[PDB]
Homo-oligomer: A and B are copies of this chain.
Amino acid sequence: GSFVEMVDNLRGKSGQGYYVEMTVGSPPQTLNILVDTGSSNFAVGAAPHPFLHRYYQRQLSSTYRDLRKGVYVPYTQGKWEGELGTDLVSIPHGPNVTVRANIAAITESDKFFINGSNWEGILGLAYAEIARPDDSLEPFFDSLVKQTHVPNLFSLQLCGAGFPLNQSEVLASVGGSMIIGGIDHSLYTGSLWYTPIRREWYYEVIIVRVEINGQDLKMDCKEYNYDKSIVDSGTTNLRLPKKVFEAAVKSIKAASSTEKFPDGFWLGEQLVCWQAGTTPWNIFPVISLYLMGEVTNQSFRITILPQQYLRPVEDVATSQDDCYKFAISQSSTGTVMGAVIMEGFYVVFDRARKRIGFAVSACHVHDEFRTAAVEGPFVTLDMEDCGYNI
């Protein structure tokens, strides 16, 4: 590990998002910011809200600059509207630099902030193409790289605990690491395999094959990326295109058929519980996603365990049972490799070389019989045809 100052600088969990501490303004105002590779706007609460115990106060910052322009950003989930401006920003547990970046001061929001999440803003790490209102609003990471000598690359190690974390616990627990400008070798085991970033807007990738316990889902690979596949820390679940979701669920059900679970479970709505320590991990299948490699006709795969796709939750009776929710759901906007998937790996967003790396995470949850994996190479043809075109 060569970036000890940034190791363990994240907190949170898959269900409420992982955040990093930042400061904005002069004097610096400390705020917790959700790490989101699924959007491109840096925005912070700038007015009172029931779920916020603090927010950005522009009138108290001598370096605040008003851009005299409003902005409205609706996400799948919720939305917010705010006022654009710029100010000096820093990351206490990050590179030792300060940069002037665009900041959307959130004045109104609907279903955006999460009660008890402990974060007050969002850091969109994706590209300018999807920044609102348009690509002229330079994203934070672009500002960071342009104004400093920090390498154009960041890596994320999201650490799920493997069990429920109450309010106090989630506040004291280390949730992972965000290495700004590099790769810390202590955060993973095995080798790093890279898949190309198909296009620079979302961190889009191309999945070329899918297996459930080694069994090929056998769908036209184009289906896996319809209408796109992205790596998104700003989303809890692994979301899959309708048809892929239906096929996957059918296969996962078949593999775990020794136990019958209610429809609400597979819909990702209701939890299932087992007596403390008896979760039958072994009856659930591993899931392998093959991704396009950097070399022609070459692919590699990442394999996740049920310890990744079954999200730990507290029982409604807060009993001593171990409960979870099925963390895979359908999408109508392409595949979304959310936080529960990222929790099994150390993910390297290599913007400089337009590629994303994957390696088994040193903090992924597993059992004595199975482990997550990143293996290769495999001979795969016509992978370009797996990519979708509107």
Residues in chain B near residue A247, CB distance under 8 A: 110
Residue A211, interface by CB 8 Å: no
Find A243's partner among B110, B243, B246, B250 (CB 8 Å cutoff): B110
Residues in chain B near residue A315, CB distance under 8 A: none
Residue A83, interface by CB 8 Å: no
- Cβ proximity bits A71-107 to B, threshold 8 Å, 1 near / 0 not: 0000000000100000000000000000000000000
Interface positions of A from 225 to 255, Cβ below 8 Å from B: 243, 246-247, 250
Residues in chain B near residue A243, CB distance under 8 A: 110
Residue A108, interface by CB 8 Å: yes
Give A103 to B243 CA distance when docked, in angstroms.
23
- Cβ proximity bits A137-163 to B, threshold 8 Å, 1 near / 0 not: 000000000000000000000000000
Interface size of A as a range? under 10
Interface positions of A from 199 to 245, Cβ below 8 Å from B: 243
Give A250 to B79 CA distance when docked, in angstroms.
14
Give A241 to B190 CA distance when docked, in angstroms.
50
Residues in chain B near residue A250, CB distance under 8 A: 81
Residues in chain B near residue A246, CB distance under 8 A: 81, 108
Residues in chain B near residue A81, CB distance under 8 A: 246, 250
Closest CB in chain B relative to A66 CB, distance in Å: 16
Q: Which residue of B lies closest to A223 (CB)?
A: B110
Residues in chain B near residue A108, CB distance under 8 A: 246
Give A250 to B110 CA distance when docked, in angstroms.
14
Closest CB in chain B relative to A72 CB, distance in Å: 9
Interface positions of A from 23 to 80, Cβ below 8 Å from B: none
Q: Which residue of B lies closest to A107 (CB)?
A: B246
- Cβ proximity bits A98-140 to B, threshold 8 Å, 1 near / 0 not: 0000000000101000000000000000000000000000000
Closest CB in chain B relative to A219 CB, distance in Å: 8
Closest CB in chain B relative to A262 CB, distance in Å: 16
Q: Which residue of B lies closest to A242 (CB)?
A: B108
Closest CB in chain B relative to A74 CB, distance in Å: 11
Give A246 to B106 CA distance when docked, in angstroms.
14
Q: Which residue of B lies closest to A246 (CB)?
A: B108
Closest CB in chain B relative to A77 CB, distance in Å: 13
Closest CB in chain B relative to A263 CB, distance in Å: 12
Give A250 to B108 CA distance when docked, in angstroms.
11
Give A116 to B259 CA distance when docked, in angstroms.
42
Give A243 to B81 CA distance when docked, in angstroms.
12
Closest CB in chain B relative to A236 CB, distance in Å: 20
Give A246 to B82 CA distance when docked, in angstroms.
13
Give A250 to B107 CA distance when docked, in angstroms.
13
Closest CB in chain B relative to A305 CB, distance in Å: 27
Closest CB in chain B relative to A282 CB, distance in Å: 26
Give A52 to B333 CA distance when docked, in angstroms.
21
Give A247 to B247 CA distance when docked, in angstroms.
39
Give A110 to B250 CA distance when docked, in angstroms.
14
Give A246 to B81 CA distance when docked, in angstroms.
10
Q: Which residue of B lies closest to A220 (CB)?
A: B111
Give A250 to B250 CA distance when docked, in angstroms.
44
Give A247 to B108 CA distance when docked, in angstroms.
10
Q: Which residue of B lies closest to A72 (CB)?
A: B250
Give A246 to B247 CA distance when docked, in angstroms.
36
Give A250 to B72 CA distance when docked, in angstroms.
11
Give A81 to B253 CA distance when docked, in angstroms.
15
Q: Which residue of B lies closest to A110 (CB)?
A: B243
Identify 5 residue pairs between A and B in the complex whose beta-carbon atoms are under 8 Å apart, listed by A's number.
Answer: A81-B246, A81-B250, A108-B246, A110-B243, A110-B247
In the A-B complex, list the 5 residue pairs whose CB atoms are closest, starting with the nearest.
A108-B246, A110-B243, A81-B246, A81-B250, A110-B247
